[PDB]
């Protein structure tokens, strides 16, 4: 996260770190959506151009974390994966359309002050909150700069959703309805973006109707980090909800 701030303790209790077992390193963000299911970006797990194709055994899920690098004894919970599910129409060849995946945990994670699931939006949630100018929140342990540092603690940044024509005019990538973009314009004088290592984490909003947090997006891609006139792009969770529902009721908790 570029130009964000340190999270508060327990600020984003659905935050999940995807951690590579060997070498030991941060692979991506992710979010906790139930006691056995975790949501992330497909390209965190499968991305042929970079020779990335992780299997269940290659990673761990770390939940309830704050510090990036420390083993947060008695606070964080480390979970093994039972099975990974990538969207069958994920488009890794061109534009990361449908950049979404689920991971089922081998065992249920116990909730605590630091570990709690985020809500997934229903159609009305999305219609009312996903509007240009409404701000969401992005969180992650990714890079602090496009090129250099790395954070000590979870970072947070609030960013406005951008009009679809402005998103489209900022990029040469083909944008689909499964994506949305967020960030400030040059004239707005505020900054912030996701960066390398933030992919898969959540873009969340707090409904003013029911006071609950909903995960509207997944950090997917961006042309650099926090560049003027560029914006971050997020998977549109509500548009892919039928797919989410289908894999959880066919296979899960």
């Amino acid at each position: 996260i570029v130009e964000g701030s340190d999270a508060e303790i327990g600020m984003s209790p659905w935050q999940v770190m995807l951690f590579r077992k060997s070498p030991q390193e941060l692979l991506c963000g992710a979010s906790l959506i139930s006691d056995r299911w975790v949501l992330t970006a497909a390209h965190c797990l499968l991305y042929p151009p970079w020779d990335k194709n992780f299997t269940e055994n290659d990673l761990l899920v770390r939940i309830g974390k704050h510090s990036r690098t420390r083993y947060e004894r008695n606070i964080e919970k480390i979970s093994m994966l039972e099975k990974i599910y990538i969207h069958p129409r994920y488009n890794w060849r061109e534009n990361l359309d449908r950049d979404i995946a689920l991971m089922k945990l081998k065992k249920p994670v116990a909730f605590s002050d630091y570990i709690h699931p985020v809500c997934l939006p229903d159609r009305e949630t999305a219609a009312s909150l996903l509007q240009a100018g409404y701000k969401g929140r992005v969180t992650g342990w990714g890079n602090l700069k496009e090129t250099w540092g790395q954070p000590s603690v979870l970072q947070v940044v609030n960013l406005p959703i951008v009009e679809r024509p402005v998103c489209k005019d900022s990029t040469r990538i083909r944008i689909t309805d499964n994506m949305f973009c967020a960030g400030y314009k040059p004239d707005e004088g505020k900054r912030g973006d996701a960066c390398e290592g933030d992919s898969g984490g959540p873009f969340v909003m707090k409904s003013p109707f029911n006071n609950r947090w909903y995960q509207m997006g997944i950090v997917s891609w961006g042309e650099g980090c926090d560049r003027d006139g560029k914006y971050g792009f997020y998977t549109h969770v509500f548009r892919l909800k039928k797919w989410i529902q289908k894999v959880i009721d066919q296979f899960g908790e």
Binding site: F19, K21, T69, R70, Y71, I78, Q150
Partner: peptide, 10 residues
């Protein structure tokens, strides 16, 4: 750079 995690998880 990452602190060792208990071997029960690895």
């Amino acid at each position: 750079d990452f602190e060792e995690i208990p071997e029960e998880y690895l």
